[PDB]
Symmetry: C3
Subunit: 296 residues, 3 copies
Amino acid sequence: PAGRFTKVAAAVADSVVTIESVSDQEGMQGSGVIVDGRGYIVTNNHVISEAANNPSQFKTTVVFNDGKEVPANLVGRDPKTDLAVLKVDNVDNLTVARLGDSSKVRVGDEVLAVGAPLGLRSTVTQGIVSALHRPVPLSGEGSDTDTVIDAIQTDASINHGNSGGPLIDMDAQVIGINTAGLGFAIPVNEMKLVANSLIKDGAIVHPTLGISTRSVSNASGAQVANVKAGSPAQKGGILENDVIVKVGNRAVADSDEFVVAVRQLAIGQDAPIEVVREGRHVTLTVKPDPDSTLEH
Amino acid sequence: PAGRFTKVAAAVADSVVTIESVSDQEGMQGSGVIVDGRGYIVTNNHVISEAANNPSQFKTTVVFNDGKEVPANLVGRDPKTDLAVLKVDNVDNLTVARLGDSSKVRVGDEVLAVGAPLGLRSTVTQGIVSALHRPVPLSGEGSDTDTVIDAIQTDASINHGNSGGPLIDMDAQVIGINTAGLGFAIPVNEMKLVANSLIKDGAIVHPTLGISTRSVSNASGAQVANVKAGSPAQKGGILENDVIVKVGNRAVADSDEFVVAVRQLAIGQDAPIEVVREGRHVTLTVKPDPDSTLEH
Amino acid sequence: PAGRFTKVAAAVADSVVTIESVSDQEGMQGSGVIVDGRGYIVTNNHVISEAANNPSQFKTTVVFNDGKEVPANLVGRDPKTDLAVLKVDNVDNLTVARLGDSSKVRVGDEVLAVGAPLGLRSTVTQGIVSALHRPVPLSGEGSDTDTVIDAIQTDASINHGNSGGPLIDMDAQVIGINTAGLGFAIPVNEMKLVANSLIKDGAIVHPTLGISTRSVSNASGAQVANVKAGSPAQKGGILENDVIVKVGNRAVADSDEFVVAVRQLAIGQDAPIEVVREGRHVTLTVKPDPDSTLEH
């Protein structure tokens, strides 16, 4: 008499894998998901951060549901979305995950946070979608930049045992990628965008303006702290001590929503920025730079 | 194919509102619920504590599901139950919450802890009723008194994002008011009693005896620490070092249940108190005073 | 219209009891379950640890669902599995719990963590089975040894209010014993084995090898720290600085799985141990000693 969650959890187990990064004096472990039949595996950047920054000493292996251990190769990584793509070579009959549409997720939707069964402290957790489009800060594992993602929030527990693993709907479809770096997942639609750039280019380009913001709230937005010289920000008129209240068509409540709002902008296209300057409401215009010009 | 919790959460979203209290150098946010069509909104006292104690500097606004922001007015507040009533004026076609009966709640009952969708870090959480009539201490936000409430305990998460919002049964009925001050809610039947006094009198009167208690357990109750001079306690015979084991018809296990037991008593009516004094079991008689005589 | 969990929780309430251990200057409380009609009650060892180590000062009582309080007698205890068996004498018409089979539990299975309704801060929590055969360390309450158990992991909350109480499937069958010493339970099949030895012998015998291990992970197992003189370990050839990678037919990932693996072995029977010694893979043979020879 198989249970509702038991059936769903069982159908996706083959699509989830353990990811192990070992050296002479360390080991790191995480979960990941088969998204392409050629052998493409998606996980968090923090899971493999160390192996990516110290590749001469770290070896990465993928452990499958059937105990099979296969060497893995890093295709690309995005510390800004906490995403990374691995590739295993010539592995026959993989079970590829059924990818969903995160736009069609609603608050109250029941979900599972699936970790790879063959993990040391692997965990499968149950809950509901508690919030959508929730900006969340994440700490950088090693030399990596701290970031903020527009996440799906869930009351299912996300921990070391399911981080990098899939967030799954009641149709066994991946609606997100668990990140434990009170549960938070990166939406599947964003992962589809970042994974495609990483498979094809080995990298991804994000917009930049040159602004360090602090959050402000009184009678609410992102307070400009530092503006870099020769930034699109300085060349747009943005001064220090301004309160950013809207980036593009997106209103901003704080420093967290500012970071997410800037990454929604188009590189090289003029974009409006609304700021409160010493009481007056000022609208300026900025053209975003690529974070990495040579890959752009 | 709408989910069980998705449907319930959706039906009550219009009855839940964001409550924002801002000044020149601060902002505070919370959730609340429409209980009356004239515009009556119930939330926690800690959400609006600061605006109530510093009204010359704080402005309170209510943000509806349809983005509508309306100024709000404080009707009354009860730090002792962590409840407060607001009123918005002349707002047409409000969706008033369907109030339930907390007496008919059982352990195991599935519930949602709904926060106002238009809140910064608003949260909708799912769980079950884990305990009924659970005395729980609460910290006082500002100059407010710390209290203890006879709560409904739930394994659904209650946090800043759903505090003041409704605890909802599977019939979309409010069975409680979430308080994040491991989830705890104030029962709907108690909120109905306190809300009626606050709408009508702008205040509420609670019983007092004049006893400070510490909890004791050996071969169990509330140990009398301090008795105020001219208290109903001193005039009833209660001495310091006594162990209160029963207040009225309610047995008391500790200092927490004592506080809740005293508020169940009738003001001005003689009431029995059973104490263990140096080994002997003594029954005394007290007549409770009003905490606020001018409003009584 | 009784809810799914409400019905299950209600059917087992009579089989769960409060356990209170009091002295002149202390009291301790826990939950337990009726497993035998003669009056046999199973709980955690940490709940009654103090009363077992200081029996001249501590009195243990069992409080039933119908308020009935009965003196209890300690039959036996296992700090190594955190299990203890109590016995109440001549109590008519007990509701004995329906014991399940923990071998037939699966990840995703919905469960309840039931605490005794008549407990001070008793709790009933809901969740799913998140992991099976998960070694978990436990702290020793008083003079008791810290241990590690092969647990069932669950996302249902296990705390002071449900510790010692049953973990229950959707058929109202006990599949485990909650231990709060992120939820962990001891499997019913293991409790059945340990309870039978405790009822019959007043004690239980576990295997010993004489090895203190630390966990190691690089390019993974239990690193031998201390070997006791005249131990089966020293007499088998085990040297210090070895990495135990397999005990019997069980692979070992760390110090935690080592402890659980040793207790699965047969006392007095030769058993294989595989170790990595200075790079070389070495297989040795050990014969396990009883932890308590006089009871063996």
